[PDB]
Amino acid sequence: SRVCQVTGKRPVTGNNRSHALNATKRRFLPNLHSHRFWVESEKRFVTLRVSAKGMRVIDKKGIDTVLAELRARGEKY
Amino acid sequence: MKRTFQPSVLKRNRSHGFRARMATKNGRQVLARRRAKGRARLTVSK
Amino acid sequence: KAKELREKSVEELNTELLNLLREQFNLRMQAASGQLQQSHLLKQVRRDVARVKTLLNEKAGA
Amino acid sequence: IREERLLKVLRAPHVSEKASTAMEKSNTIVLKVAKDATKAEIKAAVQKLFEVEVEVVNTLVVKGKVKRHGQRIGRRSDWKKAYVTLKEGQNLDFV
Amino acid sequence: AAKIRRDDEVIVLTGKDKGKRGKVKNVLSSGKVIVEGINLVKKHQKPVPALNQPGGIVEKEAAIQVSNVAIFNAATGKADRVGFRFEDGKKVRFFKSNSETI
RNA sequence: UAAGGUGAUAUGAACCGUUAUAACCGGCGAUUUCCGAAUGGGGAAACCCAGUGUGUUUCGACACACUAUCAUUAACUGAAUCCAUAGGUUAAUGAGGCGAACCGGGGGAACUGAAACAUCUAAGUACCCCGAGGAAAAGAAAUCAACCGAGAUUCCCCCAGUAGCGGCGAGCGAACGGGGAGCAGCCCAGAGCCUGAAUCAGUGUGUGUGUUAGUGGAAGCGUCUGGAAAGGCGCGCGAUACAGGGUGACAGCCCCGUACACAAAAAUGCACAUGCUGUGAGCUCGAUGAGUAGGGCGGGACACGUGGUAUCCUGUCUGAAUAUGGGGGGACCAUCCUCCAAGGCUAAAUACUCCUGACUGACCGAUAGUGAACCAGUACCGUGAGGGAAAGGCGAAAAG
RNA sequence: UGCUGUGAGGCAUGCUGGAGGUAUCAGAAGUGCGAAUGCUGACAUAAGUAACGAUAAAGCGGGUGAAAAGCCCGCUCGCCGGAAGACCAAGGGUUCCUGUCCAACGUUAAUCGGGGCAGGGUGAGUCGACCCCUAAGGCGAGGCCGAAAGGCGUAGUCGA
Numbered sequence: 031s032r033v034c035q036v037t038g039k040r041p042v043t044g045n046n047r048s049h050a051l052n053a054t055k056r057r058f059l060p061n062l063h064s065h066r067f068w069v070e071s072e073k074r075f076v077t078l079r080v081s082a083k084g085m086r087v088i089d090k091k092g093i094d095t096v097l098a099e100l101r102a103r104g105e106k107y
Numbered sequence: 108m109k110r111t112f113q114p115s116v117l118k119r120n121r122s123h124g125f126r127a128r129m130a131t132k133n134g135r136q137v138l139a140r141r142r143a144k145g146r147a148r149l150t151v152s153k
Numbered sequence: 154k155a156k157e158l159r160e161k162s163v164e165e166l167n168t169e170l171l172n173l174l175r176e177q178f179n180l181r182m183q184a185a186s187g188q189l190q191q192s193h194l195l196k197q198v199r200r201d202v203a204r205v206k207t208l209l210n211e212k213a214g215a
Numbered sequence: 216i217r218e219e220r221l222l223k224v225l226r227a228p229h230v231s232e233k234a235s236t237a238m239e240k241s242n243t244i245v246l247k248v249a250k251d252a253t254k255a256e257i258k259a260a261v262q263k264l265f266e267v268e269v270e271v272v273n274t275l276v277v278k279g280k281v282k283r284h285g286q287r288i289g290r291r292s293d294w295k296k297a298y299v300t301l302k303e304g305q306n307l308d309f310v
Numbered sequence: 311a312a313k314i315r316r317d318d319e320v321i322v323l324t325g326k327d328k329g330k331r332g333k334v335k336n337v338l339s340s341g342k343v344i345v346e347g348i349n350l351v352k353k354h355q356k357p358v359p360a361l362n363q364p365g366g367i368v369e370k371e372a373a374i375q376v377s378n379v380a381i382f383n384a385a386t387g388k389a390d391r392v393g394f395r396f397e398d399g400k401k402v403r404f405f406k407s408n409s410e411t412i
Numbered sequence: 413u414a415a416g417g418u419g420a421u422a423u424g425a426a427c428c429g430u431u432a433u434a435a436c437c438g439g440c441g442a443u444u445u446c447c448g449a450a451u452g453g454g455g456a457a458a459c460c461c462a463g464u465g466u467g468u469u470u471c472g473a474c475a476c477a478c479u480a481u482c483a484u485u486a487a488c489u490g491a492a493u494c495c496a497u498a499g500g501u502u503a504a505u506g507a508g509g510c511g512a513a514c515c516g517g518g519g520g521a522a523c524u525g526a527a528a529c530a531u532c533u534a535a536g537u538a539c540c541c542c543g544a545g546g547a548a549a550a551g552a553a554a555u556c557a558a559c560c561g562a563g564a565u566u567c568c569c570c571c572a573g574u575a576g577c578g579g580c581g582a583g584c585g586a587a588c589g590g591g592g593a594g595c596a597g598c599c600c601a602g603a604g605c606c607u608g609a610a611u612c613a614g615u616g617u618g619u620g621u622g623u624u625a626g627u628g629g630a631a632g633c634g635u636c637u638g639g640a641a642a643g644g645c646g647c648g649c650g651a652u653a654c655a656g657g658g659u660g661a662c663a664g665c666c667c668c669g670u671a672c673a674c675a676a677a678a679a680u681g682c683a684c685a686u687g688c689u690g691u692g693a694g695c696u697c698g699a700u701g702a703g704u705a706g707g708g709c710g711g712g713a714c715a716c717g718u719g720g721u722a723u724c725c726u727g728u729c730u731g732a733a734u735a736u737g738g739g740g741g742g743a744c745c746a747u748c749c750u751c752c753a754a755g756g757c758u759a760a761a762u763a764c765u766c767c768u769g770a771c772u773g774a775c776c777g778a779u780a781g782u783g784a785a786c787c788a789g790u791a792c793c794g795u796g797a798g799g800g801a802a803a804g805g806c807g808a809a810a811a812g
Numbered sequence: 813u814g815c816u817g818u819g820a821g822g823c824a825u826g827c828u829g830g831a832g833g834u835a836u837c838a839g840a841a842g843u844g845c846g847a848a849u850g851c852u853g854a855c856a857u858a859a860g861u862a863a864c865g866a867u868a869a870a871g872c873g874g875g876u877g878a879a880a881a882g883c884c885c886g887c888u889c890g891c892c893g894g895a896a897g898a899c900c901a902a903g904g905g906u907u908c909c910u911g912u913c914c915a916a917c918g919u920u921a922a923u924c925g926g927g928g929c930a931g932g933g934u935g936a937g938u939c940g941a942c943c944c945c946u947a948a949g950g951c952g953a954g955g956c957c958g959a960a961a962g963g964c965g966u967a968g969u970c971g972a
């Protein structure tokens with residue numbers, strides 16, 4: 031599925047309200063990307079599927095922390 | 108003339124037989140509904 | 154019975170079991186030939202069997 | 216094989232004209248046996264219990280008839296028939 | 311806890327036999343009893359050759375409701391009602407009027 | 413518990429028993445073929461074919477046990493590639509499926525209404541999907557109020573069809589405040605002191621209490637009518653029992669019962685007691701949840717349809733302050749008041765009945781009442797999903 | 813059947829029935845039927861009418877029997893014969909064979925039957941299925957994908 035492995039962002043739903051306000055079902059997808067990150071302590075490249083948001087958060091926290099929360103939540107990376 | 112039901116056993120059982128139902132979500136819901144109405148036989152079996 | 158059988162060893166309970174088996178085979182062989190007057194016997198033996206078996210189990214069980 | 220199983224195989228003598236015919240002419244007896252028993256076990260069981268020599272055991276399965284009792288539709292149980300060939304050697308009798 | 315039993319002498323309260331006395335043969339599950347010389351019916355029997363049973367009208371004894379029969383007190387000569395007490399450790403029956411055991 | 417029994421249609425045969433190994437009722441046990449999550453492989457369900465390891469046995473084969481996946485932990489193994497990881501094998505622990513309604517989350521209509529119809533409505537309903545418990549959810553203020561104050565949530569009655577929202581149409585619809593049901597508060601984001609010291613969980617034992625079989629349990633006769641009395645007429649008696657049912661018509665006193673008074677070898681529900689092991693009290697000093705708050709853009713939730721629209725949620729792009737601080741007080745600003753977000757647990761009052769027991773009804777009485785008083789989800793109809801009937805009454809007794 | 817009320821109605825009573833009914837004043841209503849091409853059951857009507865399923869065809873003697881155009885036996889006649897014959901697969905599931913019965917069933921009678929009731933009947937190393945092997949196609953460990961359910965597919969494992 032399209033799910034951010036970091037922030038847990040998922041597809042959500044909403045509408046097109048047109049100019050005449052005709053409401054129509056739609057979705058908002060997370061913005062997702064398959065990316066290789068450098069883990070120094072493991073000396074290795076982990077590949078996560080993450081949103082832009084996720085990436086930014088990886089910059090802030092460091093990747094060690096993030097992966098610690100991936101083993102904690104118990105989801106495989 | 109040639110009518111609509113031309114029977115076959117292997118056909119009958121692959122299409123509606125027990126295992127065929129159990130294969131899927133929907134089928135097990137059929138078998139749920141039947142067990143709930145309390146039929147004598149659920150599926151077509153010999 | 155069943156106090157009586159309880160005081161016998163496992164071997165003896167296996168010889169009785171084999172004997173009851175013969176007797177029950179014989180009895181239904183009679184009944185099958187329509188020569189059996191008392192049908193009252195079948196039930197007698199058919200149940201005794203169970204008694205024996207139910208002991209064997211608890212002697213192995215504990 | 217175990218003997219305990221054996222004594223559980225053979226239900227009953229089958230009585231009929233065909234039966235009598237084979238018993239007289241071809242030296243063969245006819246048995247109702249447990250639905251699950253096999254040619255091995257029937258060979259064993261006759262040879263053991265009647266203590267006579269079996270040549271070969273042929274079998275078939277009889278589907279019970281369908282009956283009506285008071286409008287109700289029942290089904291008579293299945294069962295298994297065994298033609299049991301004895302060698303010309305033994306003579307089994309009715310007293 | 312069963313009040314009327316086999317072999318009790320009873321007297322009949324109700325029916326064509328009202329006032330008659332007799333001896334109980336047996337009881338049935340439905341609360342019916344069958345009493346000696348009591349409640350004769352004339353029954354027709356189709357002759358049965360297997361049992362060598364001739365035909366004819368057999369007088370037989372037909373079950374009577376156990377509410378209708380009372381346990382006969384021989385002491386008082388009256389119908390009685392029955393009760394239970396514990397004598398020794400055993401459960402026993404007695405007559406209500408003279409409170410004597412049976 | 414017992415003098416009767418071996419379920420029914422349903423006789424009989426053959427028997428078992430009568431003072432307690434007949435039967436019957438309950439407690440714990442034993443057995444529990446095959447199919448089915450189905451789990452050794454497969455499969456047209458109730459079948460087909462095995463492997464490994466023990467164990468015999470005259471050595472013909474037989475018996476018995478283990479062998480699913482997936483998650484987690486361990487152990488051993490182990491490429492590309494040196495370490496390493498991936499990977500591979502064994503082992504222990506758990507999960508899978510079913511089920512009525514209620515519950516929280518993920519999706520989510522149209523008919524209809526608007527006397528047409530698109531916003532709106534229907535309605536976050538039907539339905540689908542996931543997850544859970546006997547309840548769940550919610551829950552200890554970055555809450556409201558109004559210069560006086562209240563003090564978590566849930567639920568009921570008001571406030572009020574008001575304030576408002578709305579093609580200002582159709583409609584939708586609060587809150588503040590008040591009366592009640594119920595009431596309970598806690599921990600982590602850390603050190604020191606005194607340490608098993610509150611609580612809570614596990615387990616034994618004791619008594620008490622409920623449940624699962626049971627025991628006793630009042631007092632009535634005569635006479636007419638009649639097939640039969642319980643009915644009429646006469647004289648009685650019981651009542652902490654005149655609930656109700658049955659018996660040849662309509663019985664307090666014939667039978668079962670009913671009020672009342674009792675009982676558990678064993679298993680279980682709740683209580684304190686007490687022992688136990690695991691869980692840590694209290695105090696002092698600290699500390700105080702960041703890609704977060706807010707913002708831009710797009711939607712949604714708030715009664716509140718972007719409106720002058722606060723307030724919450726977030727797909728997207730961003731982005732602070734840290735008690736010399738921040739949030740809210742219906743655009744917004746200043747003053748005044750109040751509150752501390754971005755961490756988590758929590759009983760009760762509330763909703764429901766597949767199911768067990770008891771009691772009741774100005775509910776029905778066989779075309780009614782459940783589709784189903786009867787062997788009914790049966791016959792029968794349909795390839796299938798599914799549809800889906802008809803059918804009660806001899807009599808007191810079969811004396812049929 | 814008789815009587816009585818302005819009316820829906822009421823009272824009394826002969827037969828039938830064989831155990832429940834209910835004054836009075838109140839109370840609550842699944843409260844009143846001829847229609848709805850109303851719904852269920854029952855019985856009419858046309859009418860003892862149309863019809864009795866291939867225009868291949870019957871006739872006689874005897875038997876059985878309550879009763880024979882139809883059943884069994886015999887004799888002639890006639891029809892099919894690349895089928896109206898014989899053997900399978902499919903599909904059915906006892907219809908097979910014997911005895912016995914004639915209510916219903918059989919478009920008539922039926923003594924007959926594919927009807928009723930009871931019994932018997934299906935014997936495999938070499939014929940099939942199973943089994944070994946795969947086709948299309950299916951399921952599919954890991955894996956890729958997807959709001960959830962799920963979709964696709966690798967090693968496999970099924971599928972004549």
Ligand SMILES: [Mg+2]
Nearest residue numbers: 052053054055
């Ligand atoms: Mg819409």
Ligand SMILES: [Mg+2]
Nearest residue numbers: 271272273936
């Ligand atoms: Mg042979």
Ligand SMILES: [Mg+2]
Nearest residue numbers: 273274275936
């Ligand atoms: Mg064979």
Ligand SMILES: [Mg+2]
Nearest residue numbers: 289290291292
């Ligand atoms: Mg059967």
Ligand SMILES: [Mg+2]
Nearest residue numbers: 450451452453
């Ligand atoms: Mg298996």
Ligand SMILES: [Mg+2]
Nearest residue numbers: 453454461462
């Ligand atoms: Mg296989």
Ligand SMILES: [Mg+2]
Nearest residue numbers: 450451453454
């Ligand atoms: Mg399998």
Ligand SMILES: [Mg+2]
Nearest residue numbers: 491492493494
């Ligand atoms: Mg290497």
Ligand SMILES: [Mg+2]
Nearest residue numbers: 508509510543
């Ligand atoms: Mg579950």
Ligand SMILES: [Mg+2]
Nearest residue numbers: 511512513514
């Ligand atoms: Mg449910």
Ligand SMILES: [Mg+2]
Nearest residue numbers: 515516517518
């Ligand atoms: Mg929901």
Ligand SMILES: [Mg+2]
Nearest residue numbers: 518519520536
């Ligand atoms: Mg939603």
Ligand SMILES: [Mg+2]
Nearest residue numbers: 522524533534
């Ligand atoms: Mg619309």
Ligand SMILES: [Mg+2]
Nearest residue numbers: 524525526528
């Ligand atoms: Mg409209």
Ligand SMILES: [Mg+2]
Nearest residue numbers: 517518519536
């Ligand atoms: Mg929802």
Ligand SMILES: [Mg+2]
Nearest residue numbers: 548549550758
């Ligand atoms: Mg909760």
